[PDB]
Design an enzyme around this catalytic site. Structure first.
Site, PDB file in Angstrom:
ATOM      1  N   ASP A  40       5.864   1.887 -10.934  1.00 15.56           N
ATOM      2  CA  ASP A  40       4.246   2.151 -11.274  1.00 15.56           C
ATOM      3  C   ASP A  40       4.203   2.652 -12.612  1.00 15.56           C
ATOM      4  O   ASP A  40       4.999   2.047 -13.646  1.00 15.56           O
ATOM      5  CB  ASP A  40       3.785   3.292 -10.548  1.00 15.56           C
ATOM      6  N   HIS A 104      -1.712   6.825 -12.890  1.00  7.87           N
ATOM      7  CA  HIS A 104      -1.475   5.992 -11.728  1.00  7.87           C
ATOM      8  C   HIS A 104      -0.463   6.444 -11.245  1.00  7.87           C
ATOM      9  O   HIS A 104      -0.290   7.038  -9.999  1.00  7.87           O
ATOM     10  CB  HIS A 104      -2.059   4.667 -11.777  1.00  7.87           C
ATOM     11  N   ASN A 206      -7.122  -4.481  -3.648  1.00 12.23           N
ATOM     12  CA  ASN A 206      -8.210  -3.888  -3.732  1.00 12.23           C
ATOM     13  C   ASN A 206      -9.185  -4.827  -3.875  1.00 12.23           C
ATOM     14  O   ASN A 206     -10.333  -4.307  -4.627  1.00 12.23           O
ATOM     15  CB  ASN A 206      -8.259  -2.667  -4.560  1.00 12.23           C
ATOM     16  N   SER A 276      -3.448   1.559  -3.297  1.00 13.08           N
ATOM     17  CA  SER A 276      -2.468   2.321  -3.978  1.00 13.08           C
ATOM     18  C   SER A 276      -2.153   3.804  -3.583  1.00 13.08           C
ATOM     19  O   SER A 276      -0.987   4.210  -3.754  1.00 13.08           O
ATOM     20  CB  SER A 276      -2.894   2.177  -5.617  1.00 13.08           C
TER      21      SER A 276
END
Ligand SMILES: [Ca+2]
Ligand SMILES: [Ca+2]
Ligand SMILES: [Ca+2]
Length: 339
Positions: A40, A104, A206, A276
């Site tokens: 990430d 994130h 998404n 996520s």
């Protein structure tokens, strides 16, 4: 139950369409001696993460993505992937002009193993587990070969000119992806990570599109995760289809971030939506399942672990808009199954 200030807000750990993480902590499993790698944006130095974070590595090769002044290095610190003036964007689209930093990877890391029972902040699904930050995303995202290299290393794979991982992970969380079929190189690193013993857990995506039209979902040997809401139906943005293996809470998820709009200024907590946010739920449950499997002297292959998680899901609320795997990940049934 945890003592952390804002655990009550984390419906997704305990409530009707939550992951029943509380029912496993009740049994004494918290993911002790399990390591989860998070591929990430890297990690913050956050009081509610620090103690559960292991040494990691920064795989970002382009220094204009990394924003720390060099290519690959041993510090996975999330510098902040903020950007101004269409620096990543399709000018003149106003929605692409600027983003504050996402934090994130820290929001994801917190869902798996935020420091729990230390009063401040939040809990993690698997708070007895530890997290290895594999920084592969920065301003604009990241290269697929940085992501692939990163995930291989996360499992114990040796990479040219990078020191060996002392903390190879049994679970690798990939809250990421893009359009297009799985690359040769990606599929190869996934297979190698899996052959090392790691379960690769990935976001469906998404774009309210068929997840098969994306990677890492279209790869073999991954566990693809869809997003559900507090009402147990598909969150409207979640990708879908036959290659989605299961689902988990992916809306109004509280975790660990920073308040900074550009660079880290101070520890914060925020709610996020996304597959996520769903993925780290499954990665945390995976870690819970392993701690329990350890307790009865039981070894589990990634294939065995993926089947345990897929077969022990709780039901959705209705037949759903779209296919979203077998159900919502369910730590209670999953753990109960292996004991
Ligand atoms: Ca660097
Ligand atoms: Ca760095
Ligand atoms: Ca806490």
């Amino acid at each position: 139950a945890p003592n952390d200030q804002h655990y009550r807000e984390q419906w997704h750990y305990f409530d009707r369409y939550g992951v029943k993480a509380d029912k496993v902590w009740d049994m004494g499993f918290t993911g002790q001696n399990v390591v989860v790698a998070v591929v990430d944006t890297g990690i913050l130095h956050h009081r509610d993460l620090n103690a559960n974070v292991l040494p990691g590595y920064d795989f970002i090769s382009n220094s204009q993505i990394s924003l720390d002044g060099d290519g690959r290095d041993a510090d996975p610190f999330d510098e902040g992937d903020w950007f101004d003036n269409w620096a990543c964007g399709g000018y003149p689209d106003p929605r692409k002009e600027r983003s504050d930093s996402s934090w994130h990877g820290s929001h994801v890391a917190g869902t798996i193993a935020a420091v729990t029972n230390n009063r401040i902040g939040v809990a993690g699904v698997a708070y007895g587990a530890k997290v290895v930050p594999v920084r592969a995303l920065g301003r604009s995202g990241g290269y697929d070969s940085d992501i692939s290299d990163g995930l291989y290393w996360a499992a114990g794979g040796r990479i040219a000119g990078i020191p060996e991982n002392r903390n190879p992970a049994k679970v690798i969380n990939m809250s990421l992806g893009s359009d297009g079929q799985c690359s040769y190189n990606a599929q190869t690193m996934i297979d190698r990570a899996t052959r090392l013993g790691a379960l690769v857990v990935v976001a469906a995506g998404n774009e309210n599109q068929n997840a098969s039209n994306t990677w890492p979902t279209s790869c073999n040997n991954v566990l693809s995760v869809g997003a559900t809401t507090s009402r147990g139906i598909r969150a409207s943005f979640s990708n879908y289809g036959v290659d989605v293996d299961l689902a988990a809470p992916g809306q109004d998820i509280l975790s660990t971030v920073d308040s900074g709009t550009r660079r880290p200024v101070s520890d914060a907590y925020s709610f996020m939506a996304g597959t996520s946010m769903a993925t780290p739920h499954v990665s945390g449950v995976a870690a819970l399942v392993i701690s329990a499997a350890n307790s009865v002297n039981k070894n589990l292959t990634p294939a065995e672990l993926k089947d345990v998680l897929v077969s022990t899901t709780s039901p959705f609320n209705g037949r759903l808009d779209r296919a979203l795997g077998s159900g919502i990940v369910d730590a209670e049934a999953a753990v109960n199954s292996v004991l």
